[PDB]
Amino acid sequence: NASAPFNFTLPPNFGKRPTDLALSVILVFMLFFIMLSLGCTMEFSKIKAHLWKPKGLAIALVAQYGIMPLTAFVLGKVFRLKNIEALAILVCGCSPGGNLSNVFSLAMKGDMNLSIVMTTCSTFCALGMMPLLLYIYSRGIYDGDLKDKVPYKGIVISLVLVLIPCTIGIVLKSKRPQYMRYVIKGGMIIILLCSVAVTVLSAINVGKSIMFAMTPLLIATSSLMPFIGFLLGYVLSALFCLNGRCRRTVSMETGCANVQLCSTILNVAFPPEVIGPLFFFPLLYMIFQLGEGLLLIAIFWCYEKF
Amino acid sequence: EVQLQQSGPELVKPGASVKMSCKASGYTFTSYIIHWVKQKPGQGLEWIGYINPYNDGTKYNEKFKGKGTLTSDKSSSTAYMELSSLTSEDSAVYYCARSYYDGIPHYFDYWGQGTTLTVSSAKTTPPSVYPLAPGCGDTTGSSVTLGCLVKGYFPESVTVTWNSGSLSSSVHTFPALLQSGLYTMSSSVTVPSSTWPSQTVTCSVAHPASSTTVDKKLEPS
Amino acid sequence: DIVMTQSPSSLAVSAGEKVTMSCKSSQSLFNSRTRRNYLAWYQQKPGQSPKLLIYWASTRESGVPDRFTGSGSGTDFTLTISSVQAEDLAVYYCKQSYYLLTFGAGTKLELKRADAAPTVSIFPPSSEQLTSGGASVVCFLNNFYPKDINVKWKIDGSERQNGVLNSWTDQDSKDSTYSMSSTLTLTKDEYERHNSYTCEATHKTSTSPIVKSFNR
């Protein structure tokens, strides 16, 4: 069909919509509140204990940056994907773990201090050494340098906005732990309005509902990526003979990945008109990995009942 | 459809900086990249590099690192190419081409009309046409050839015609190639020997680049 | 890097003949992830910008005639015209874009003819030209088909071949044959002491070369 750009187009106002800015700022505030509530239920003792024993940190790093980009490259090679799709899936695989991974860790409730130290060290290591692995694994795709286009200020900004609420919660619990129920109720209400806000988003913010015309095989690989990540994390944890507490948290931290940086790099590298439904692909990937997370939540609770 | 518009012919001194303009307004200018191809006369195509107007990303060929410089203007939908380092052999024809770019440029579907660049000392000079005439003891024959050689003209704008000759029949316009900075061309016309004395033949040269249209008639020795 | 090599680089065919050019590239420029076989065939008529014909080495651009077919994989590629006509005479490059954008040497298409009948001509410099400060003797060869032709200048049985310039015509559409010219330039006070000025041209139409002498 020769080489033509997709008919998918974005509204001119979408670049600086006040509604989009309001959604971004309320999402940032929401992440701040949920991170504060999440770091409330941790203490520095286990943080220091897990930092002194970096075996879990080492296994998480070797799973996230050693095999995950390799399996992303292999999956792109075997499914005969296009250059843009292969680059997108490779960047998604190379991404470090996100904060929603820590939210699912709270849902599973296993070794939260290890989870937070894992995610902060993963983000730091990503910042340090993601462009080199991206250049190594992107031979034949995007001959451009791309080193100066991966976000750097965004990474440190996210790291600070994650660390500060956690430290605030830890120091609040350590020094004066008498206002627990109020902040937990605030967590419940922030979660409720988060459900309301995500419903509002999915209703009146997506637009151009043509994601179903997206290629089924890229849907299949976006489906398989979180599942294979979860399975690889679980087995790699199992064969290194640690305690049973860390299995689920390390496996599901390895499986989950961030998608904001992938969207930013795809948007800055290519025009919106060139990219078709792959622009909405990160949203689909995040939604489906959340679905897998909920499925494993249900499986874990069903197992623990029996 | 869309067409690629070039700046036009350019004449430049050996030491200077020349900028080429390529314009295309038939589509979304940011959706495609613009390449530049250098073609020496009769030496085939040669790649230079491409620019991506969306992010102003440029890639250069190995030899064009020193002189290659590509800039783009989203507002004007134009791509600019600058050399800033010129030599006598640098003169060639440059094309700007459009190619779709996902991760690798696919193919140059559309091309511009081309830009001809000449590097020399300029200093336009008028030609000095000189007639050609045999008769140095040769027996000649049934038919003989004639011509009018020209010397010392700088610009390519030159045209020779034979109003009193054989017209479009048995006429060959030999192209000129540079030598010593002033290239020369030649023309040939065939006239039967029997009818040659009966009517005279005159060669007229047209030089639109200057105000010289000198005409002269060849005389046998 | 990748270098593109074309074997024929020059051929002459009639209306019914097929050309079947081939350029072997350097290595297997086939993408395993996407079975596209990156390659593009361009046609450049004289005095015109190149025009795309085949992309992916298998798919022809819309608007081209059905006679242009391109088939190939790995390193070997071939473009066939079959029923070639008079407007298909151009230069083709089979550009590749697998790793770096490199163009081929190019092939030239001509029209066949039975034989050639070259005609020689010797022209002494004009009398007024000597007074200008130099001397210039010019000879041109007309109506010869083969391109491979050599001309040499003999002076008193000696060969110099210094300061000689050759110009070829562009195979006018009137006839398949084309002409060539040779020029010799020298300054004044350096023309009359030796005379001679013997011109010889070697052509494939006859084993014995044709030679023309000059006097005074």
Which CATH number does A18-305 carry? Answer: 1.20.1530.20
3 state DSSP class of A56: helix
Rounded to whole angstroms, the Cα distance separating B106 from B101 reads: 6
Residue C117 lies in a domain: no
Contact (Cβ atoms closer than 8 angstroms) between residue C199 and residue C214:
yes
Residue C62 lies in a domain: yes
Which residues have CB under 8 Å from C132's CB, separation 6+? B128
Number of Cβ atoms within 10 Å of the Cβ of B138: 14
Number of folded domains that form chain C: 2
Rounded to whole angstroms, the Cα distance separating C185 from C179 reads: 20
Rounded to whole angstroms, the Cα distance separating C126 from B60 reads: 52
Report yes or no: C124 at the B interface, CB cutoff 8 Å. yes
Residues of chain A in contact with residue C36, where contact means CB-CB under 8 angstroms, are: none
Q: Can you spell out the DSSP letters for A123-190?
A: HHHHHHHHHHHHHHHTTTS--S--TTTS-SHHHHHHHHHHHHHHHHHHHHHHH----HHHHHHHHHHH
Rounded to whole angstroms, the Cα distance separating B140 from B143 reads: 7
Q: Which fold has domain B128-217?
A: Immunoglobulin-like (2.60.40)
Rounded to whole angstroms, the Cα distance separating C146 from A87 reads: 54
Angle of CA points A219, A291, A33, to nearest 5°: 120
- Decide: residue C162, CB within 10 A, 0-12 exposed, 13-18 middle, 19+ buried: exposed
Contact (Cβ atoms closer than 8 angstroms) between residue C127 and residue C26:
no
In this complex, the residue of A2, A3, A80 whose CB is nearest that of residue C34 is: A80
- Of C68, C88, C111, which residue constitutes the final position of a domain? C111
In this complex, the residue of A2, A3, A82 whose CB is nearest that of residue C34 is: A82
Q: Would B4-119 and B128-217 be classified into the same CATH topology? A: yes
Resolution of this entry, Å: 3.3
Residue C116 lies in a domain: no
Residues of chain A in contact with residue C38, where contact means CB-CB under 8 angstroms, are: none
Round the CA-based radius of gyration of chain C to a whole number and report it: 24
Contact C136 B149 (CB under 8 A): yes
Same-domain status, C142 and C164: yes
Same-domain status, C200 and C159: yes
Residue C162 lies in a domain: yes
Rounded to whole angstroms, the Cα distance separating A202 from A200 reads: 6
Q: Domain of C86: which CATH number?
A: 2.60.40.10
| Domain assignment of residue C72, given as a range | 5-111
Distance of CA A12 to the CA centre of its chain: 28
Please state the length of chain A.
306
Long-range interactions of A88-91: CB distance < 8 A, separation 24+: A88/A262, A88/A266, A88/A278, A88/A281, A88/A282, A89/A218, A89/A221, A89/A222, A89/A225, A90/A134, A90/A137, A90/A138, A90/A141, A91/A134, A91/A261, A91/A262, A91/A265, A91/A266
Beta bridge partners of A69: none
Nearest by Cα to B188 from B141, B128, B148, B134: B148
Beta bridge partners of C165: C183
Q: What's the token pair of residue A195?
A: 């459900």
Q: Say which amino acid occupies C60.
A: R
Are β-strands B159-161 and B202-206 bridged in parallel, bridged antiparallel, or unpaired?
Answer: antiparallel
Rounded to whole angstroms, the Cα distance separating C19 from B88 reads: 37
Contact (Cβ atoms closer than 8 angstroms) between residue C57 and residue C104:
no
Q: How near does any CA of chain A get to the CA of C33, in Å?
A: 5
Which CATH number does B4-119 carry? Answer: 2.60.40.10
Rounded to whole angstroms, the Cα distance separating A145 from A134 reads: 10
- For C182, list phi and psi in degrees, rounded to 5: -135, 140
Q: Can you spell out the DSSP letters for A239-267?
A: HTT--TTHHHHHHHHHH----HHHHHHHH
Please indicate the experimental technique that yielded this structure: cryo-EM
Contact (Cβ atoms closer than 8 angstroms) between residue A252 and residue A97:
no
- Decide: residue A259, CB within 10 A, 0-12 exposed, 13-18 middle, 19+ buried: buried
Q: Which residue has the tokens 């830009």?
A: B115
Report yes or no: C121 at the B interface, CB cutoff 8 Å. yes
| Helix (H) or strand (E) run with residue C182 in it | strand C178-187
Contact (Cβ atoms closer than 8 angstroms) between residue B132 and residue B146:
yes
Residues of chain C in contact with residue A2, where contact means CB-CB under 8 angstroms, are: 55, 59, 61-62
Q: What's the token pair of residue A77?
A: 């090679």
Domain positions in chain B are 4-119, 128-217
Q: Which residue has the tokens 């390895």?
A: A254
3 state DSSP class of A80: coil
Sheet (strand C69-73) strand order? C21-23, C76-80, C69-73
Please state the length of chain C.
216
Q: What's the token pair of residue A56?
A: 């879990």
Rounded to whole angstroms, the Cα distance separating B192 from B143 reads: 4
Q: How near does any CA of chain B get to the CA of A219, in Å?
A: 20
Q: What's the token pair of residue C173?
A: 């559409």
Domain positions in chain A are 18-305
- Of C57, C80, C111, which residue constitutes the final position of a domain? C111
Residue B112 DSSP label = B
Sheet (strand B69-73) strand order? B5-6, B19-23, B78-82, B69-73
